[PDB]
Symmetry: C2
Subunit: 128 residues, 2 copies
Amino acid sequence: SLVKALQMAQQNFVITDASLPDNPIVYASRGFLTLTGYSLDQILGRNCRFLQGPETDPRAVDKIRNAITKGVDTSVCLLNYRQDGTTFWNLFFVAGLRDSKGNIVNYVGVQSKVSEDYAKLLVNEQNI
Amino acid sequence: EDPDYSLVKALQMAQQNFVITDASLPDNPIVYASRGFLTLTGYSLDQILGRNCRFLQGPETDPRAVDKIRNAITKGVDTSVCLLNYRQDGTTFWNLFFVAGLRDSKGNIVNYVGVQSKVSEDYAKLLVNEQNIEY
Ligand SMILES: *[C@@]12=NC3=[C]C([C])=C([C])[C]=C3N([C][C]([O])[C]([O])[C]([O])[C]OP([O])([O])=O)C1=NC(=O)[N]C2=O
Ligand SMILES: *[C@@]12=NC3=[C]C([C])=C([C])[C]=C3N([C][C]([O])[C]([O])[C]([O])[C]OP([O])([O])=O)C1=NC(=O)[N]C2=O
């Protein structure tokens, strides 16, 4: 009763269109704007990867990239950057929205800023 | 290990037929719609976005069923309703849709997610008899 219990804050979510080449962001909640610091215009049309930066863990990025292309739902905690250049730890959950026949045309992303000590716990788990 | 998200679950059981409304905006207008909702209703994105979902309703739509959602919506309680909707061409179908409010850190509903589905005639009769029980 933790990983899901805390993460439950859902006002931070995006929707992406997989039918467009780089699975770009087609919708972002105002909460996502608040969290990331970006305007709607500087988000829409872009792959969510733009939040990442120098100190972002590449091996973590690889894990979700694979999860997404394989269509499996997963969550991941990695280092993200705001509009201004500050960094927060992002625990986000990505889930593919399958049509009646099982094809993914949209994806849901739910983002969460997590504390330092919780991030350390989540990252170490990923290091296995 | 993995979350039981109100939003994620509502969406996964949606069958690519859903919308997102913005509660902060006047009259809780649709700010996103899946292609599934597009084909179902016959409207284009330009004919949908910025509008309240009530535009799918018409002369025969049960005003009682409508009252049910309106109430559940103002009280921020998740519910599903089966009412008669009208496509852009004016043909009718029975819509069984589910709506769930999304709250911010302060508990305020800032977004709604709706999940619509066309139901067969025989199935509708069932859902409606059940619906009528509370009266
Ligand atoms: C971003 N959230 C997010 C939400 C959705 C629904 C999807 C599909 C992806 C993300 N990403 C992951 C990112 O876009 C990309 O998939 C990964 O970087 C791996 O692919 P690449 O090609 O870059 O190796 C999110 N990434 C973030 O860093 N933060 C989020 O909140
Ligand atoms: C519409 N789906 C739908 C989805 C969401 C997310 C929300 C918030 C509402 C709907 N409506 C209900 C409608 O917009 C309105 O809230 C009710 O009619 C009651 O309000 P009013 O002020 O009009 O009495 C949906 N209505 C439909 O008829 N069909 C759906 O698919």
